[PDB]
Amino acid sequence: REIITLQLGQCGNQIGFEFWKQLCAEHGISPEGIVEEFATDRKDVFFYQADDEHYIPRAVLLDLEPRVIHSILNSPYAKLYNPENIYLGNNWASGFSQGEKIHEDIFDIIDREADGSDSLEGFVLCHSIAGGTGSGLGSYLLERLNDRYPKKLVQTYSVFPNQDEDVVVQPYNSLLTLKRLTQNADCVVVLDNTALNRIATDRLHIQNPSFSQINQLVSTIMSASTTTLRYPGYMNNDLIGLIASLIPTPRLHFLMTGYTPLTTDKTTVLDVMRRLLQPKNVMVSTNHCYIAILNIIQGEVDPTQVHKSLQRIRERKLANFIPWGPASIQVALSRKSPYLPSAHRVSGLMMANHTSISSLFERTCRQYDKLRKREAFLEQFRKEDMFKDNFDEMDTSREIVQQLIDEYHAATRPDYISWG
Amino acid sequence: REIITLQLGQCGNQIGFEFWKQLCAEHGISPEGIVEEFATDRKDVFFYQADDEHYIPRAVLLDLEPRVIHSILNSPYAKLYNPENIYLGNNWASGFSQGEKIHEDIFDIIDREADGSDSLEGFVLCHSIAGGTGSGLGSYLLERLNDRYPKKLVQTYSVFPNQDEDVVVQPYNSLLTLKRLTQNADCVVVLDNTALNRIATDRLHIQNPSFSQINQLVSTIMSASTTTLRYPGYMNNDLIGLIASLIPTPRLHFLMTGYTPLTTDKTTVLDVMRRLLQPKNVMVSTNHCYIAILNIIQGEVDPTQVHKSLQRIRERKLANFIPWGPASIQVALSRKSPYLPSAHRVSGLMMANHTSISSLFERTCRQYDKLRKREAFLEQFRKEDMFKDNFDEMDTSREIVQQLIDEYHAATRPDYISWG
Amino acid sequence: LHGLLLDQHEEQFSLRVEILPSYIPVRVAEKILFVGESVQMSILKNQEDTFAAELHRLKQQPLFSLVDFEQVVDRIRSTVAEHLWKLMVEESDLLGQLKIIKDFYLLGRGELFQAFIDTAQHMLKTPPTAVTEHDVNVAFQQSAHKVLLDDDNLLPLLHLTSGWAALGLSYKVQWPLHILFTPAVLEKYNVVFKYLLSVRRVQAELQHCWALQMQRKHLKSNQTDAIKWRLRNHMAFLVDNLQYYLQVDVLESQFSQLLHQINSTRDFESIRLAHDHFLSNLLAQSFILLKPVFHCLNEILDLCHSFCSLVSQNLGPLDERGAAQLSILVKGFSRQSSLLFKILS
Amino acid sequence: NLMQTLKKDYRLVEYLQAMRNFFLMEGGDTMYDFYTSIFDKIREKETWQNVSFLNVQLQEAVGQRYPEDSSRLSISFELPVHILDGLTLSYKVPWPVDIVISLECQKIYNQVFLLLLQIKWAKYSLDVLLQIHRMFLLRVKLMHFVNSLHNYIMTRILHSTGLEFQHQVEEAKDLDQLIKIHYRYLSTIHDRCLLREKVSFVKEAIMKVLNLALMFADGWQAGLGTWRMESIEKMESDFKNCHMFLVTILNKAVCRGSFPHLESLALSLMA
Ligand SMILES: Nc1nc2c(ncn2[C@@H]2O[C@H](COP(=O)(O)OP(=O)(O)O)[C@@H](O)[C@H]2O)c(=O)[nH]1
Ligand SMILES: Nc1nc2c(ncn2[C@@H]2O[C@H](COP(=O)(O)OP(=O)(O)O)[C@@H](O)[C@H]2O)c(=O)[nH]1
Numbered sequence A, B: 001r002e003i004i005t006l007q008l009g010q011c012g013n014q015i016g017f018e019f020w021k022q023l024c025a026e027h028g029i030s031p032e033g034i035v036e037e038f039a040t041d042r043k044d045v046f047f048y049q050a051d052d053e054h055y056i057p058r059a060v061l062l063d064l065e066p067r068v069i070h071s072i073l074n075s076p077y078a079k080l081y082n083p084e085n086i087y088l089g090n091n092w093a094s095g096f097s098q099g100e101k102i103h104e105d106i107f108d109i110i111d112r113e114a115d116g117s118d119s120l121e122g123f124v125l126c127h128s129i130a131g132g133t134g135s136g137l138g139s140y141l142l143e144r145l146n147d148r149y150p151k152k153l154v155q156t157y158s159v160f161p162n163q164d165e166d167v168v169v170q171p172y173n174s175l176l177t178l179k180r181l182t183q184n185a186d187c188v189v190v191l192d193n194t195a196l197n198r199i200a201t202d203r204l205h206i207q208n209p210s211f212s213q214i215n216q217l218v219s220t221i222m223s224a225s226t227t228t229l230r231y232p233g234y235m236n237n238d239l240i241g242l243i244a245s246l247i248p249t250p251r252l253h254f255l256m257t258g259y260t261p262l263t264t265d266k267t268t269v270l271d272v273m274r275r276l277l278q279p280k281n282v283m284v285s286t287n288h289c290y291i292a293i294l295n296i297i298q299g300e301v302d303p304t305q306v307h308k309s310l311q312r313i314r315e316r317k318l319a320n321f322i323p324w325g326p327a328s329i330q331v332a333l334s335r336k337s338p339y340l341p342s343a344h345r346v347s348g349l350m351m352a353n354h355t356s357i358s359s360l361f362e363r364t365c366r367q368y369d370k371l372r373k374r375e376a377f378l379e380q381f382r383k384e385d386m387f388k389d390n391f392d393e394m395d396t397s398r399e400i401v402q403q404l405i406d407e408y409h410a411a412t413r414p415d416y417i418s419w420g
Numbered sequence C: 001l002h003g004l005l006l007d008q009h010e011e012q013f014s015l016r017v018e019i020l021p022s023y024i025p026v027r028v029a030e031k032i033l034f035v036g037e038s039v040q041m042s043i044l045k046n047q048e049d050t051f052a053a054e055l056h057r058l059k060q061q062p063l064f065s066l067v068d069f070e071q072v073v074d075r076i077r078s079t080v081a082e083h084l085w086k087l088m089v090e091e092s093d094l095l096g097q098l099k100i101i102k103d104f105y106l107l108g109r110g111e112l113f114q115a116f117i118d119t120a121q122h123m124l125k126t127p128p129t130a131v132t133e134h135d136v137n138v139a140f141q142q143s144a145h146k147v148l149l150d151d152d153n154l155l156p157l158l159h160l161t162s163g164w165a166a167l168g169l170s171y172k173v174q175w176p177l178h179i180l181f182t183p184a185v186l187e188k189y190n191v192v193f194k195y196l197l198s199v200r201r202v203q204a205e206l207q208h209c210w211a212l213q214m215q216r217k218h219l220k221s222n223q224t225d226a227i228k229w230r231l232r233n234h235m236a237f238l239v240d241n242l243q244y245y246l247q248v249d250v251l252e253s254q255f256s257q258l259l260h261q262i263n264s265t266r267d268f269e270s271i272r273l274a275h276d277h278f279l280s281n282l283l284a285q286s287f288i289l290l291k292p293v294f295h296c297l298n299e300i301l302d303l304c305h306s307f308c309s310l311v312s313q314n315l316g317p318l319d320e321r322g323a324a325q326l327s328i329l330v331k332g333f334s335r336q337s338s339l340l341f342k343i344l345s
Numbered sequence D: 001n002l003m004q005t006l007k008k009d010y011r012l013v014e015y016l017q018a019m020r021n022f023f024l025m026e027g028g029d030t031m032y033d034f035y036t037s038i039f040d041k042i043r044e045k046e047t048w049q050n051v052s053f054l055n056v057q058l059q060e061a062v063g064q065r066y067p068e069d070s071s072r073l074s075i076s077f078e079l080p081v082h083i084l085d086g087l088t089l090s091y092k093v094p095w096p097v098d099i100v101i102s103l104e105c106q107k108i109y110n111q112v113f114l115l116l117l118q119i120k121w122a123k124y125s126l127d128v129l130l131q132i133h134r135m136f137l138l139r140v141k142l143m144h145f146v147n148s149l150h151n152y153i154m155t156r157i158l159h160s161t162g163l164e165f166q167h168q169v170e171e172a173k174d175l176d177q178l179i180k181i182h183y184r185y186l187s188t189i190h191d192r193c194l195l196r197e198k199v200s201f202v203k204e205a206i207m208k209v210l211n212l213a214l215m216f217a218d219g220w221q222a223g224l225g226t227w228r229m230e231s232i233e234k235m236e237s238d239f240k241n242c243h244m245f246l247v248t249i250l251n252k253a254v255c256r257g258s259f260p261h262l263e264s265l266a267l268s269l270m271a
Helices: A010-026 A068-073 A092-101 A103-116 A134-148 A172-185 A193-203 A210-230 A239-246 A269-277 A305-316 A357-374 A382-387 A392-410 B010-026 B068-073 B093-099 B105-117 B136-147 B169-185 B195-202 B210-230 B269-276 B305-316 B355-374 B382-387 B394-410 C026-040 C048-060 C066-088 C095-104 C113-120 C132-145 C184-211 C212-214 C235-266 C268-286 C292-316 C322-339 D002-008 D014-019 D030-039 D051-060 D103-125 D134-171 D177-192 D203-218 D232-252 D259-266
Strands: A001-010 A047-049 A055-057 A060-063 A120-125 A152-158 A290-298 A330-334 A347-355 B002-008 B059-060 B120-123 B153-155 B290-298 B330-335 B346-354
Touching: A001 A010, A001 A103, A001 A134, A001 A269, A001 A392, A001 B002, A001 B068, A001 B305, A001 C048, A010 A060, A010 A134, A010 D232, A055 B195, A060 A103, A060 A210, A092 A103, A092 A134, A092 A382, A103 A134, A103 C184, A120 A134, A120 A239, A134 A172, A152 A210, A172 A357, A193 A210, A210 A239, A210 A290, A210 A330, A210 A347, A210 B382, A239 A290, A239 A305, A239 A347, A239 C322, A269 A290, A269 A305, A269 A347, A290 D030, A290 D203, A330 C235, A357 C268, B002 B010, B002 B105, B002 B136, B002 D232, B010 B059, B010 B136, B010 B210, B010 D002, B059 B136, B068 D030, B093 B105, B093 B136, B093 B169, B105 B120, B136 B153, B136 B169, B169 B355, B169 B394, B169 C026, B169 C268, B195 B210, B210 B305, B210 B330, B210 B346, B269 B305, B269 B346, B305 B330, B305 C132, B330 C066, B330 D134, B355 B394, C026 C066, C048 C066, C095 C184, C095 C235, C184 C268, C184 C292, C235 C268, C235 C292, C235 C322, D030 D051, D030 D103, D103 D177, D103 D203, D134 D203, D134 D232, D203 D232, D232 D259
Parallel strands: A001 A060, A001 A120, A120 A152, A290 A330, B002 B059, B002 B120, B120 B153, B290 B330
Antiparallel strands: A047 A055, A290 A347, B290 B346
């Protein structure tokens, strides 16, 4: 059914601004939200249908200590997103406390939209981990949503931050976010600043303006992850139908990304699949193995070869997995949109549950464990100490994330049939 | 059945001047009132028809301390309105007292027209609330008319004034007008200066000359509210038949307005009905709900789709109402006139009884309650004190309007069965 | 040439094999009928006499040669058949209406046949067609209204002959403008619609039955092993998720081939072979052609339905003698899944 | 050549539209003037059947350049409510056009005219006006219902069908077809309005629930409080139960009968 995106924090607000803009041009929408003369899609799930064809995204924009929310307002697309729902520290504790006083007005803004929709399916957060204001406020709002909508689900386009390690409290902030994210988020899609920065260095010479260019990379993945839902067809029509295959255990819900034409600016299906399993096409930075893999292709794809193609990759075995699950790589197919360029006539993406992402979680847990002993940055800011005098949520978070680190490696073992 | 518009006060005289001019061009009439050269429309209702070339309309013009009644006289349309019936402070009390000395000659001018016409359905007041001279004189004339014509009914095109809050006594003047209007007016159609000013800012860049441009907006609504009566049709050719559904209870006789192509300068009825139910198209500024809704459409409208169209607005539920009444949205249809432009070939208006208008009444009651305690502007002008030494009509008005504020919220409740 | 019926008395209408002369082969006789039926529904009139001169020429010759007779019948076959294709592909929009048969009939649409089952679930009881019959069509048309998909749509009608057991669909064609779609052919499309509906309905229950991530395990440890359904949800899902990915290639492969072949050839009679092969392959390849395999798959489907039932009522995690039901189900799925190794054989 | 001379010379299109607009099928503003006069209770004879008075009222409301061939004279027929039938109106049409407007068919048009004047009477009966305010609540539960009927009969059935007919007769080119199409259009107007087939099953239900609105305003006159009516609970129960009977009756149509004409108005919004 219709999905409401809670884009929050300066970094999160930057990737929601672009994601909606990306679906503006891709769909038949202008910068004023009006349909255009030039422009068969299920526009409804991602866009509210107004009366005079003003298809307004159901975006919830939360601004805290706003600077980049003012720049979003001075844009040609300011009219495109007008649910008229925008409401006024670098510490996780500093963000969580600020969110608690304004929780009811931000929560009424959630209600208004929920009333507008016929059936609400999911809350998709453009979350920033260790995002200063973005983290802490995002964890708190993550906890409120599940209690109010126990039946409903929450996804997170977490931009997990890896910049080669400025935030001196970055590990502490991230540590707290995951504990909330592991028990209070049904799904999470992981992205990495360094992994994309390495891709940016690979495809282009761009190094210093890494954040502006990488926004486009995060966007192409984000638009792409939903293309099966937005367009018509009997292909995984709903979100939940798709979510089940990618996440096979309540605890392991983190998803890796990849894009066969990183240089998207003919190709047979057999080729676009093999290219993806290679690790340059991946955008994330003891035996290790995938838990279940899925792929979606949008272009001029022949249908008869896919079975021949499904069998060819299996014989190559470019993707090595031995999970407690009996899961298989799955082939899915969609239509590339008209109007926008058809370059790389065939172009694909993959979303997969991989135990390698455990390593990225352990690296921040490693920085934190080292930092915890030193107590170099306890902040001891009165907000930090008064909010957390015991400082035991960090230890509660440390055991919960360690259980997660343990569970992952248990998945690699032959007996995840038994307790993680 | 002919109607006579008792247009009074400078503001009221400005919107009657334009409303008659609007029906001059719309109907087959020229500026002298002589027939248009090009000329199905029945002009008898709004225009005295004689073998005399001038078809003078039944317009009553009252001037107090005149300035703009003089500008109305120096116009090309001075000949068009010649019943030869125009007769010579900013306080509600100041206006009421001036009206009382001249009541009999102004009342004989009412009689002349009543004797002249075959039958008079009602008297239409282009009333101005807190209109300086317009209010007070208008309340007094409202009280005399019902006693003399107990069988006859009075409507009020009240331009309720909201300019973001110059008149320092504006709340006091308005407070008194409503008490008279609640017990001595059969119907009232509410309009708002700010709501229209906001529309003017929306459709156009006009901000500083708000009064001159907004006159056209009030006019389009006014001509439109009567078009079912003006132009012959299978149904709703009598005003009392048209407003019967909207007023479900005598006390709640205030009507909200809206127009689908505010920018009227093809469209199916499924869409036009739907756009009318969005709040930008509305021109007025605890659960809340409409009491009964009605709509009239004038253009190239197909008649088979209306039932499917009726049923689609039923599915969209764009209009949320739960009144003690069992009232339903009602579809009505009329002919757009020839000669004048047919732009927005299909174009509509809606008149509805909504409990939200209670809020606008409470805001002036709020300004007044705050002002009453301070007694900052008791005027204490000898006219004000000598006319009202007790100052208890304001308190009588305060309880009567509070009963109205209470009754409205009572309509929202499940037991308007109990007294509201 | 003229289409006249009963050019003579006995000894639309069709072949009378007993009175065909032996030397005129049964295949040359069939060609005559097609030329004949099409005339009633051309450029044949423009060159009618030229073809009557040749048929006149064959009359003058002294002896009968089949080699000569066919060549005329065949020439006349060439133009009369080319005419039906000449129009149906361009003026009857033959290719464009096919998108309409697949979109609303082979479950090729996502919104119309998914949201319809959500807003019509109540028809699960046996109906006499007294009230539910009107309500399901009412539901279908309402379903489409949620997001546009609102143009014409008068023709599609659902019918009830176990609330979801019978929902056979019927489209109304323009008969002078469509002889390709027949009473017999749309019946076979109907059999597939009912079977392809069964898989779609079961896969909805399982994805919904995935309310463990959504509620029971979300924020609550509850009991693990002591109070779990063994998460057989994952194994039932594969035998039901895999059929959906299979059904995506048997249907989508064929529709690429039927809509590319139709484009190349130029006689309507031939195109009819393409379509009668496009539906003929969809049946056996999808396994709907009745077989032991489809029967095993339907049993798998009924067991799946019952497993949805157990978890549905339990609510807060508990075993109300749930194990006894789970035990029949866990045993049953294993026995039946082994029958799916018949495919491996 | 006939059809085309029977339009320019012995006008058929003007006469056919004359039979509809400002006549039995459509009131216009002309019939609003005529109907309000006969309804008035002041100076009113028990059935107000004075033919010279009724004819005089019609000429005042001719409201056109051509004001001839309309009588309103046929003798009134000699009733749970006043339920006064009669007032029959007959239009005198000449010979070169009589061929398609039959003295037999005039009866079918006359039948629909009566129903249009009772519904207008019932709605006009609840519109003249304006425990003591509990009655004002019942004013809305009744007006909505009768007004919803008048919407369906006047606009859904007789206006929309009257547009397919005005357009279709332009295309036809015959003396017998122009008759067959006109007979089809009257056999449909008289049937979609509930005046044929089952009568005790469907028609009597609307008739009595009309009869209650008529008694309700007939037992009320404007301007006092002491009506001393204890029957407001009996009338509240009557309308509610008789209403439940009406919408179950329209709901009986789902199994058999004219579903399109009914399942359109069966959605009366109930409550
Ligand atoms: N992918 C991406 N990440 C960003 C961008 N800008 C900031 N970030 C991330 O946001 C995090 C810090 O959030 P910050 O911008 O300090 O939030 P603030 O407290 O509102 O300024 C860092 O971990 C960055 O990696 C961007 O343009 N793209
Ligand atoms: N809609 C509208 N309102 C006006 C216009 N001019 C004045 N008013 C209103 O008239 C009210 C004051 O009446 P006023 O002009 O003082 O009457 P006076 O005492 O005769 O001058 C204010 O509430 C204004 O909102 C106009 O052109 N259009």
